[PDB]
């Protein structure tokens, strides 16, 4: 019903009865939207990474199932109140099979499943479908609200630390894409960057390329260009040299799964960034909504790390040429996430609840408490 | 075979290392302008290969000009040789090999007889240029033996029979005359049946690792695993890596090492994970004239290396007035982070307890 202030592109285009997803693989050269009509469409979109970013995955999954179930209710494939309920639970389990590392998808759909059980199966199929639609629409609006909070908490905290020192403007180093493309609206870590920019307090955001999928070079740069946000693109390996030679106020990254102790699963390279950040005395912040927090996982070693097709590294995602030689004694290691241990999150964890600073020593973070906050 | 430098008396051909692994193209070097451009465009690259091809390139071009009467006298050849060494040195600044080699060649040209025939003065330089090729071969033969012996012994102390090596960029036969430096060590470990795996960083933006190092390992059946640069920290935590073995472009008096961008990042992580780091380079990569890393000129290159698909010349990054690209192609690894040692043809020099960890002048003066 409302356009975002600050530039659409939004990766998720929703209107009652219709879901369209921006193909984030084709940016920045091409702007393509694909219709999501079935549960199979949304599963594929997540798996192929047409839609990506932890929150965007969860929100589009809820909306995708809602539009598809509403469709099946209208045409005749469904059926009955009970079997709409049955289809919704079955669709939630199936969509959850797409990508394992980011918890947002699991937190959202499991919470939706519990609410689906609470629904009345006696209702006239379409009534049960519309009830789920409203629940799915709620997770979109909630994420918008979560990001509005993150931006404020993040920018104010970083600016207070800046003015405690002798600095009026901040330089931020980031990785991957955590803007409007990775979320419903504004973003998380890039949301903080946006707020600092609007206040006239951002000197520069430094963006890591983020191999092999290039979320930084392709998506983050794109977002900064559309809004005239001062941005500098670097190669992932140049991060250490950057922090030594130039003053970086904070490393602000996103998250896919934050464990109970604080251990953060995020895009591959984030751990590398955290190790270097500690070496150079640059405080590291993790920005994520509380739906990215995971009480069910105790520590980082219990997180399933997604590995993807070796063609992401060996082939051009554009010219389709195999840019790497092939042989029987060659292997490709392609994990698309790593773990940043809570020890290396020196700045704090930024949610919509506020900014949670680490403890002096062991269990640096209590994630259950952050979720329990008002 | 898979050599980047193809030399035979009167002819120099250079493999276009930009086009590998998809294409194998050799270009004739006929003029001093050809060799300057080859280095600048990075058709030939890698510190030692740059210096060797520069000497051979000047030698071939001059011999050709002395043959067809383009250079009439012996002093005309002498003047051309001295000025050509200065001109080629203007190509790429960071790697010292080019400068050490050509400055050493200039002093030898100065003591040549200018009254002699044009062909006679040119042939004298040819033999000097041929010498720098053979010397580099000999340097690398030493490096691979010293490095492999030290690393294997270090692993045997921890109770391991085979080693896992993590590297960056390309330091094999493509980057040198023969065998290589850091990948030379990897080769020697592989031949002895003592290498479990070499892990190769992609090495953005030019992709020396993904394109050249992988290629070399494939041609020789060397067990290899390609990773993205950012995955290096996760690799070292999750898997046992015995040593990080890297090359060099300029090694300062105190030990500070200029090497391909990302090497410093690798060194920082190596210290965090307790993985000893080795720098493998010939003594012609050592630099007494530079005291420390802050006095090294770091080459920055065209932003299209990052923003465009590498020939095809198509942009893959959005463009705007408030976007800039930071493209340094080297960084400094301080001597503190070289925990394993510096591997030369002289041997493996371990770091001192404190202070300046290395004495480069002492290494050069060894037998």
Residue A172 · residue A202 · CB < 8 Å: yes
Distance in angstroms (rounded) separating the CA atoms of residues B124 and B247:
32
Residue B251 · residue B321 · CB < 8 Å: no
Where b means 16+ CB within 10 Å and e means fewer, B75-106 reads: bbbbebbbebbeebbebbbbbbbbbbbbeebb
Which chain A residue's Cα is nearest to B333? A241
3-state SS string for chain A? CCCCCCCCCCCEEEECCEEEEECCCCCCCCCCEEEECCHHHHHHHHHCCCCCCHHHHHHHHHHHHHHHHHHHHHHCCCCCHHHHHHHHHHHHHHHCCCCCCCCHHHHHHHHHHHHHHHCCCCCCCHHHHHHHHHHHHHHHHHHHHHHHHHHHHHHHHHHHHHHHCCCCCEEEEECCCCCCCCCCCCCCHHHHHHHHHHCCCEEEEEEECCCCCCHHHHHHHHHHHHCCCCEEEECHHHHHHHHHHCCCCEEEECCCEECCCCCEEEECCHHHHHHHHHHCCCCEEEECCHHHECCCCCCHHHCCCCECCCHHHHECCCCCCECCCCCCCEEECCECEEEECHHHCCCEEECCCCEECCCCCCCCCCHHHHHHCC
- Out of B22, B233, B327, the one facing A321 most closely (by C-beta) is B22
Looking at residue B64, the DSSP 8-state letter turns out to be: H
| Collapsed DSSP state (helix, strand, coil) of residue B28 | strand
| Collapsed DSSP state (helix, strand, coil) of residue B269 | helix
Please state the domain extents for chain B: 1-160, 161-367
Q: For residue A331, which residues of chain B lie inside 8 Å, CB to CB?
A: 224-226
3-state SS string for A91-112? HHHHHCCCCCCCCHHHHHHHHH
With CB atoms and an 8 Å threshold, state whether A272 touches B230: yes
Which chain A residue's Cα is nearest to B272? A275
Which chain B residue's Cα is nearest to A25? B316
CATH topology of domain A168-374: Rossmann fold (3.40.50)
A interface test, pick of B187, B224, B230 with most A CB neighbours within 10 Å: B230
Distance in angstroms (rounded) separating the CA atoms of residues B101 and B95:
11
With CB atoms and an 8 Å threshold, state whether B262 touches A325: no
Distance in angstroms (rounded) separating the CA atoms of residues B320 and B298:
26
Write out the CATH class of domain B1-160: mainly alpha
A29 near B CB under 8 A: yes
**Residue B56 Cα distances to A371, B18, B46, B94, angstroms:** 69, 20, 15, 20
Distance in angstroms (rounded) separating the CA atoms of residues B355 and B358:
9
Sign of the Cα torsion A101, A105, A108, A109 reads: negative
Compute how many other C-beta atoms are within 10 angstroms of the C-beta atom of residue A20: 16
- Selected residues 152-181 of chain A with any CB under 8 Å from a CB in chain B: 175
B249 is catalytic: yes
Dihedral angle, C-alpha B306, B308, B311, B312, nearest 10 °: 160
Beta strand pairing call for A202-208 and A170-174:
parallel
With CB atoms and an 8 Å threshold, state whether A235 touches B327: yes
Per DSSP, the residues of B131-197 read HHHHHHHHHHHHHHHHHHHHHHHHHHHHT-SSEEEEE-S--STTTSSSS-SHHHHHHHHHHTT-EEE
With CB atoms and an 8 Å threshold, state whether A221 touches B326: no
- Out of B21, B210, B323, the one facing A233 most closely (by C-beta) is B323
For B229, phi and psi rounded to 5 degrees?
-55, -40
Q: Which residues does B221 contact at the CB level (< 8 Å), separation at least 6?
A: A327, A328, A329
Note every long-range contact of B115-121, with CB atoms under 8 Å and residues 24 or more positions apart, other chains counting: B115/B74, B115/B75, B116/B74, B117/B74, B118/B66, B118/B69, B118/B71, B118/B72, B118/B73, B118/B74, B118/B76, B118/B77, B119/B63, B119/B66, B119/B67, B120/B74, B121/B66, B121/B74, B121/B77, B121/B78, B121/B81
Resolution limit, Å: 2.1
Q: Which of B188, B201, B208, B358 is nearest to B283 (CA)?
A: B358
- Selected residues 264-323 of chain B with any CB under 8 Å from a CB in chain A: 264-266, 268-269, 272, 306-307, 309, 312, 314-323
Residue A185 · residue A143 · CB < 8 Å: yes
Q: Write out the E strands in B205-298.
A: 224-227, 243-246, 250-251, 257-260, 277-280
Sign of the Cα torsion B326, B332, B336, B342 reads: positive
Distance in angstroms (rounded) separating the CA atoms of residues B186 and B157:
19
Please pick, among B34, B242, B249, B331, the residue that the annotation labels catalytic: B249
Q: How far is CA B299 from the centre of its chain?
A: 14
For B242, phi and psi rounded to 5 degrees?
-75, -40
Distance in angstroms (rounded) separating the CA atoms of residues B200 and B227:
6
A169 — alpha (psi -120 to 50), left (phi > 0) or beta?
Answer: beta
The secondary structure element, H or E, covering residue B12 is strand B11-15
Compute how many other C-beta atoms are within 10 angstroms of the C-beta atom of residue A99: 21
Where b means 16+ CB within 10 Å and e means fewer, A57-95 reads: bbbbbbbbbbbbbbbbbeeeebebbebbbebbbebbeeb
User: Which residues on neighbouring strands pair with residue A348, listed in sequence order?
Assistant: A285
Q: At what angle do helices A39-47 and A54-75 cross, to 10 degrees?
A: 160
Its CATH architecture, for the domain A2-167, is Up-down Bundle (1.20)
Q: No. of H helices and E strands in chain B?
A: 11, 14
Q: Which of A147, A138, A161, A137 is nearest to A193 (CA)?
A: A147
Where b means 16+ CB within 10 Å and e means fewer, B236-250 reads: bbeeebbbbbbbbbb
With CB atoms and an 8 Å threshold, state whether A279 touches B261: no
Residue length, chain B? Answer: 367
Looking at residue B315, the DSSP 8-state letter turns out to be: B
- Selected residues 239-268 of chain B with any CB under 8 Å from a CB in chain A: 261-262, 264-266, 268
Beta strand pairing call for B323-325 and B277-280:
unpaired
With CB atoms and an 8 Å threshold, state whether B326 touches A242: yes
Domain B161-367 homologous superfamily, CATH: Translation initiation factor eif-2b; domain 2 (3.40.50.10470)
- Out of A228, A229, A272, the one facing B269 most closely (by C-beta) is A272
On the CB side of B248, CA atoms within 13 Å amount to 30
Residue B230 · residue A274 · CB < 8 Å: no
| Collapsed DSSP state (helix, strand, coil) of residue B223 | coil
| Collapsed DSSP state (helix, strand, coil) of residue B89 | coil
Distance in angstroms (rounded) separating the CA atoms of residues B358 and B167:
22
On the CB side of B178, CA atoms within 13 Å amount to 13
Distance in angstroms (rounded) separating the CA atoms of residues B171 and B16:
16
B205 near A CB under 8 A: yes
Residue A182 burial by Cβ neighbours in a 10 Å radius (0-12, 13-18, 19+)? buried
- Out of B205, B226, B325, the one facing A313 most closely (by C-beta) is B226
User: Which residues on neighbouring strands pair with residue B226, listed in sequence order?
Assistant: A332, B200
Cis omega (within 30 of 0) on the bond before A78? no
- Out of B217, B223, B316, the one facing A217 most closely (by C-beta) is B316
Going across the sheet that includes B330-333, the strands are: B250-251, B257-260, B330-333
């Amino acid at each position: 019903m409302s356009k975002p202030h600050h530039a659409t592109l939004e990766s998720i285009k929703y209107t009652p009865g219709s879901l369209r997803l921006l193909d984030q693989r084709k940016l920045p050269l091409e702007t393509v939207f694909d219709d999501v009509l079935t549960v199979e469409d949304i599963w594929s979109a997540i798996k192929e990474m047409r839609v990506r970013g932890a929150p965007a995955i969860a929100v589009s999954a809820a909306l995708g199932i809602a539009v598809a179930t509403q469709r099946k209710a209208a045409n005749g494939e469904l059926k009955s109140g009970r079997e709409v309920q049955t289809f919704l639970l079955t669709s939630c389990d199936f969509v959850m099979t797409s990508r394992p590392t980011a918890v947002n998808l699991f937190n959202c759909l499991r919470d939706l499943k519990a609410q689906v059980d609470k629904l009345d199966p006696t209702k006239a199929a379409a009534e049960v479908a519309q009830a789920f639609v409203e629940l799915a629409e709620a997770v979109y609006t909630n994420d918008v609200a979560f990001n509005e909070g993150i931006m404020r908490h993040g920018a104010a905290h970083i600016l207070a630390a800046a003015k405690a020192e002798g600095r009026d403007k901040v330089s931020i180093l980031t990785i991957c894409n955590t803007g409007a493309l990775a979320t419903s609206r504004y973003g998380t870590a890039l949301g903080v960057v946006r707020q600092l920019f609007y206040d006239g307090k951002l000197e520069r955001v430094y963006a890591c390329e983020t191999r092999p999928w290039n979320q930084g070079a392709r998506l983050t740069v794109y977002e900064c260009v559309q809004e005239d946000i001062p941005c500098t693109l670097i190669c992932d390996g140049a991060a250490s040299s950057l922090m030594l030679n130039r003053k970086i106020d904070a490393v602000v990254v996103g998250a896919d799964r934050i464990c109970q102790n604080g251990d953060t699963a995020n895009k591959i390279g984030t751990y590398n960034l955290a190790v270097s950040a500690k070496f150079h005395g640059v405080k590291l912040y993790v920005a994520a909504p509380t739906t990215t927090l995971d009480v069910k996982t105790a520590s980082g070693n219990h997180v399933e790390i997604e590995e993807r097709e070796p063609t992401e590294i060996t082939t051009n995602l554009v010219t389709k040429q195999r840019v790497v030689a092939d042989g029987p004694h060659l292997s490709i290691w392609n994990p698309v996430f790593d773990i940043t241990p809570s020890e290396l999150i020196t700045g704090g964890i930024i949610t919509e609840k506020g900014v949670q600073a680490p403890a002096a020593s062991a269990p640096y973070y209590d994630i259950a408490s952050i979720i329990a906050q008002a």
